[PDB]
Amino acid sequence: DVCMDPEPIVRIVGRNGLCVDVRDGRFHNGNAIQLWPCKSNTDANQLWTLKRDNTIRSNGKCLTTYGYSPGVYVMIYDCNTAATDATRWQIWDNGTIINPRSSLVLAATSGNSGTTLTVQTNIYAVSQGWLPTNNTQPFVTTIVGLYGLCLQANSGQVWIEDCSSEQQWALYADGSIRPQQNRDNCLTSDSNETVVKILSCGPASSGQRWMFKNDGTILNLYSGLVLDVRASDPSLKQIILYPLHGDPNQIWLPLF
Amino acid sequence: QVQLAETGGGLVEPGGSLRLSCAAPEFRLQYYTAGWFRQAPGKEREWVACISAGGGVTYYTGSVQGRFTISRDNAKRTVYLQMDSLKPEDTAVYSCAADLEYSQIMPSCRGSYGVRGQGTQVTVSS
Amino acid sequence: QYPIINFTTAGATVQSYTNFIRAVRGRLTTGADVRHEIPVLPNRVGLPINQRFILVELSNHAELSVTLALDVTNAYVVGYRAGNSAYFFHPDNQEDAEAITHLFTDVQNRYTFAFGGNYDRLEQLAGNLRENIELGNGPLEEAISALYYYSTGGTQLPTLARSFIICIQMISEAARFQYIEGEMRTRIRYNRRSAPDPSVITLENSWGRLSTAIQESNQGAFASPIQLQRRNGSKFSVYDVSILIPIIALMVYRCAPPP
Numbered sequence: 084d085v086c087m088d089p090e091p092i093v094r095i096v097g098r099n100g101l102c103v104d105v106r107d108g109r110f111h112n113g114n115a116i117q118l119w120p121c122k123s124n125t126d127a128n129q130l131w132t133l134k135r136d137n138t139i140r141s142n143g144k145c146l147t148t149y150g151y152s153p154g155v156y157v158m159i160y161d162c163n164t165a166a167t168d169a170t171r172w173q174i175w176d177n178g179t180i181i182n183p184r185s186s187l188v189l190a191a192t193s194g195n196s197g198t199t200l201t202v203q204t205n206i207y208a209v210s211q212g213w214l215p216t217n218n219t220q221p222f223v224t225t226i227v228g229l230y231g232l233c234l235q236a237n238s239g240q241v242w243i244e245d246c247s248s249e250q251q252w253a254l255y256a257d258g259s260i261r262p263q264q265n266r267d268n269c270l271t272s273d274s275n276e277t278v279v280k281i282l283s284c285g286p287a288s289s290g291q292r293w294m295f296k297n298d299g300t301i302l303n304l305y306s307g308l309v310l311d312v313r314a315s316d317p318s319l320k321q322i323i324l325y326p327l328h329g330d331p332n333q334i335w336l337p338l339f
Numbered sequence: 340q341v342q343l344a345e346t347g348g349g350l351v352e353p354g355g356s357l358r359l360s361c362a363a364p365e366f367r368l369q370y371y372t373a374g375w376f377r378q379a380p381g382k383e384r385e386w387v388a389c390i391s392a393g394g395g396v397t398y399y400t401g402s403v404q405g406r407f408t409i410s411r412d413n414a415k416r417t418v419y420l421q422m423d424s425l426k427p428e429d430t431a432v433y434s435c436a437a438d439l440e441y442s443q444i445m446p447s448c449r450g451s452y453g454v455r456g457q458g459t460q461v462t463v464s465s
Numbered sequence: 466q467y468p469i470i471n472f473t474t475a476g477a478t479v480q481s482y483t484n485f486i487r488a489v490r491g492r493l494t495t496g497a498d499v500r501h502e503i504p505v506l507p508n509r510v511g512l513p514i515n516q517r518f519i520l521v522e523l524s525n526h527a528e529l530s531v532t533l534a535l536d537v538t539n540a541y542v543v544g545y546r547a548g549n550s551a552y553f554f555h556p557d558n559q560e561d562a563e564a565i566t567h568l569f570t571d572v573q574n575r576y577t578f579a580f581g582g583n584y585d586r587l588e589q590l591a592g593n594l595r596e597n598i599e600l601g602n603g604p605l606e607e608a609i610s611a612l613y614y615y616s617t618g619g620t621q622l623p624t625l626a627r628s629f630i631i632c633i634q635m636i637s638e639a640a641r642f643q644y645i646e647g648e649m650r651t652r653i654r655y656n657r658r659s660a661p662d663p664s665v666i667t668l669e670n671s672w673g674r675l676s677t678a679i680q681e682s683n684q685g686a687f688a689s690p691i692q693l694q695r696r697n698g699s700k701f702s703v704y705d706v707s708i709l710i711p712i713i714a715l716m717v718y719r720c721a722p723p724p
């Protein structure tokens with residue numbers, strides 16, 4: 084036949100593990116959409132129905148962008164009163180939520196609690212990553228790569244080492260990979276052969292956003308490069324960002 | 340776990356020889372690349388020498404090139420390390436291993452080497 | 466006469482097994498139908514019969530060699546051949562029975578079991594749960610020798626079921642999951658015999674529902690959560706596909722994508 088896609092009422096988590104929120108729970112037309120700590124109740128301001136028409140609705144009102152230029156805030160609005168194609172959104176497999184008319188992307192240009200959501204030019208940054216799920220917490224696993232060794236981070240340096248039962252990693256909804264022991268530090272890469280480090284997630288930049296792919300590689304979306312173990316040499320204690328070929332030094336596996 | 344038996348080791352005067360035998364009762368060692376690793380008390384695990392499954396290809400590190408001889412007996416499922424002309428830098432804990440990661444032998448003995456031995460102390464002192 | 470993929474346990478290494486599971490995945494799908502970056506197995510509805518099965522020849526250190534048959538539609542084992550005998554799982558519908566007629570034509574005589582192939586059957590016959598049947602290269606070597614000798618009357622019925630549980634998990638479930646593949650990949654590495662974790666057990670039980678949950682989702686988000694388990698017996702729920710993209714390698718055809 085043909086797959087019947089449903090309309091699951093769900094939360095939308097994004098930057099810094101924060102949820103999409105309707106400011107103060109007020110639903111008058113034009114009210115701003117913000118970034119709030121995820122709740123554990125049934126308040127309608129954080130539960131979003133992924134409707135069959137590429138709209139995103141909460142308490143009847145639609146998720147709508149104020150304009151089609153970068154920097155305008157995303158608001159709550161009547162679904163019939165708003166502009167016909169200002170209420171439409173696409174949720175991509177790589178975590179990006181995009182308005183397909185402006186081609187701009189739902190983003191939170193700040194990490195603070197209460198940050199007004201905006202539409203921005205798609206750079207595949209952590210500030211532009213989202214995950215529709217009722218799961219409040221990040222997914223803590225151990226990332227295993229070449230030779231069955233574990234991805235370990237100590238201070239800013241990150242390398243690969245034989246697994247010891249730190250090596251735990253919080254896979255956040257915004258696409259950032261963070262060490263479990265310090266959840267405001269991210270798996271960062273500056274340039275787009277460069278070396279990966281553990282800087283703060285403050286910038287929430289393209290280069291701190293990662294995507295686990297089906298081929299076994301951890302892919303940086305903006306650059307197109309994947310995680311690589313320099314010359315398949317774990318003793319170098321260097322994880323770099325190399326173009327794609329698919330050898331074991333590029334293959335990883337989350338072992339939760 | 341340990342699945343290789345170790346026989347050998349001890350104290351030696353610099354410039355002397357020594358043999359390190361290593362067999363596997365229940366492990367089929369004749370199929371996989373076998374190698375030797377060592378580690379000084381301070382640091383750190385370094386590789387010594389490996390040998391192809393068919394004994395055709397062998398690799399050695401710099402500190403042992405020309406002085407150590409790795410060999411194997413696939414009829415007896417054993418692996419040996421002949422340590423001639425020993426230097427005081429060879430003082431470490433030597434362990435035999437068998438890589439099950441790669442079908443062939445890699446340069447610099449690259450691999451996982453998940454099946455290892457108990458390991459014995461080698462001491463080159465005057 | 467279908468595609469033949471061969472793998473041996475004599476000197477089996479992590480790469481020879483990685484190349485084996487990858488070669489099995491290559492002959493299972495066309496590779497074209499991919500949904501949310503996870504491939505989809507061909508549809509059984511309008512599938513020609515010469516495109517229905519693939520064969521897997523298994524040999525070990527001993528001279529014994531055994532060949533399995535896999536259903537392309539779900540990568541599961543439907544039967545096996547050993548020498549001049551062929552044994553098939555009890556099919557679950559009239560159509561599956563006829564498709565079995567076309568597997569091992571050139572045999573002395575073929576037999577069909579009274580039981581199906583799902584785990585609740587094989588665990589009862591073997592007298593062992595999946596949580597206690599160990600997996601690894603060693604177990605796979607013993608499973609091959611046991612499968613061959615059943616044609617000669619050497620293997621008891623419980624052991625035959627136990628051997629099936631090992632072959633299905635290490636091949637079928639491995640072709641379906643990079644997770645289960647990597648879990649078998651680490652057993653081959655350090656040469657160990659471990660039983661599958663609750664993580665592996667749950668992924669096997671949920672594979673049927675995970676295929677359904679992903680194909681008919683709304684832009685990746687599930688209609689209802691699927692419950693999974695960690696390495697420890699800890700239960701968590703999955704609401705979206707992004708986390709399962711590194712976990713699932715193949716899905717069974719449920720429905721067709723929208724135009």
Ligand SMILES: *[C@@H]1O[C@H](CO)[C@@H](O[C@@H]2O[C@H](CO)[C@@H](O[C@@H]3O[C@H](CO)[C@@H](O)[C@H](O)[C@@H]3O)[C@H](O)[C@H]2NC(C)=O)[C@H](O)[C@H]1NC(C)=O
Binds near residue numbers: 091124687689690
């Ligand atoms: C994520 O969590 C939220 C709340 O914890 C879930 O929303 C709730 O979803 C259920 C099922 O869709 C709703 O209950 C059902 O209502 C229908 C009405 O047609 C009724 O026929 C059923 O018997 C059942 O009672 C419930 O009202 C709803 N709660 C709200 C909207 O506040 C949501 O489903 C969860 N998402 C997923 C993907 O599991």
Ligand SMILES: *[C@@H]1O[C@H](CO)[C@@H](O[C@@H]2O[C@H](CO)[C@@H](O)[C@H](O)[C@H]2NC(C)=O)[C@H](O)[C@H]1NC(C)=O
Binds near residue numbers: 175176179207304305
């Ligand atoms: C994020 O995912 C979407 C998935 O559709 C990608 O956008 C499309 O990618 C396909 C290639 O598979 C192109 O043919 C389309 O032109 C793209 N755009 C649209 C609107 O479909 C997008 O490229 C992905 N981003 C990254 C960095 O992989």
Ligand SMILES: *[C@@H]1O[C@H](CO)[C@@H](O[C@@H]2O[C@H](CO)[C@@H](O)[C@H](O)[C@H]2NC(C)=O)[C@H](O)[C@H]1NC(C)=O
Binds near residue numbers: 469470488522
């Ligand atoms: C697995 O083994 C079988 C038999 O050893 C292979 O079939 C042979 O393939 C070669 C091509 O390299 C042909 O020349 C032979 O005639 C085939 N023999 C047969 C069909 O009996 C089969 O291709 C192997 N599969 C893989 C994936 O390597």
Ligand SMILES: [Cl-]
Binds near residue numbers: 084085086
């Ligand atoms: Cl239809």
Ligand SMILES: [Cl-]
Binds near residue numbers: 108
């Ligand atoms: Cl609020």
Ligand SMILES: [Cl-]
Binds near residue numbers: 092130131132140141
């Ligand atoms: Cl809602």
Ligand SMILES: [Cl-]
Binds near residue numbers: 138162163167170
């Ligand atoms: Cl509308």
